Amino acid sequence: APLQLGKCNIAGWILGNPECESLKRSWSYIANGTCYPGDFADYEELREQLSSVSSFERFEIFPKERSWPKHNITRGVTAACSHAGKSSFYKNLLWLTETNGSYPKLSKSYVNNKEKEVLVLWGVHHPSNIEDQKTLYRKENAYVSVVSSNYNRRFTPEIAERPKVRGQAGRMNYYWTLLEPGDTIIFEANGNLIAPWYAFALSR
């Protein structure tokens, strides 16, 4: 039987758009997208990845309140993702910002210790201007590094004046990779990382 996303699409569901329900289960096919504007890398491949699963589990990959002691985990909400008439954010990601005047370099790793695949999603924030970049990340030049046994990318914030989309001039790109059992993913960044908070374990 199909997975019913109702008002949402796969992007809004899998990122955790606050308007979208967060779920083990299975389905044969899949029947509010990104509340923050941006590009979703490999989106159609992800739709196909998720099209039929035999067990699916949402799990807290990086516990929000215990993982990021040198960064701010609470101001990272936006009117673009509002909920209960208040600013909010994707339920599966975490918008890290500076604390105490600094955004130190972070380094965070996860090993898939399960006996099935793990789907990890993250984002990179692209401010519209350099003043907002400095306000949030305390430096004009930042990087996000994501490495696993078969994935290696370094992301550079693209700062540029852009049309307002859903009220926002900034953007947020979304990315993902899969981890087989025993594979390790490492996040390194000194700004702009929208960190994993919940990830997914699934089987084909």
Residue numbers in the entry: 50 to 72, 75 to 82, 89 to 261
Cite, word for word, the article reporting this structure:
Hemagglutinin (HA) is an IVA surface protein that allows the virus to attach to host cell receptors and enter the cell. HA is a homotrimeric glycoprotein, with each monomer composed of two regions: (1) the head, comprising the receptor binding domain (RBD) which is crucial in viral attachment, and (2) the stalk, that is responsible for viral and cell membrane fusion in the endosome. Mammalian IVA infection is initiated through HAs binding to α2,6 sialic acid-linkage galactose receptors on the host cell surface, before entering the cell via endocytosis. Following endocytosis, HAs undergo conformational rearrangements due to the low pH of the endosome, leading to membrane fusion.
In addition, we also solved a 2.0 Å resolution crystal structure of the refolded head of A/Fort Monmouth/1/1947, which appears quite similar to the lower resolution full length mature trimer structure.
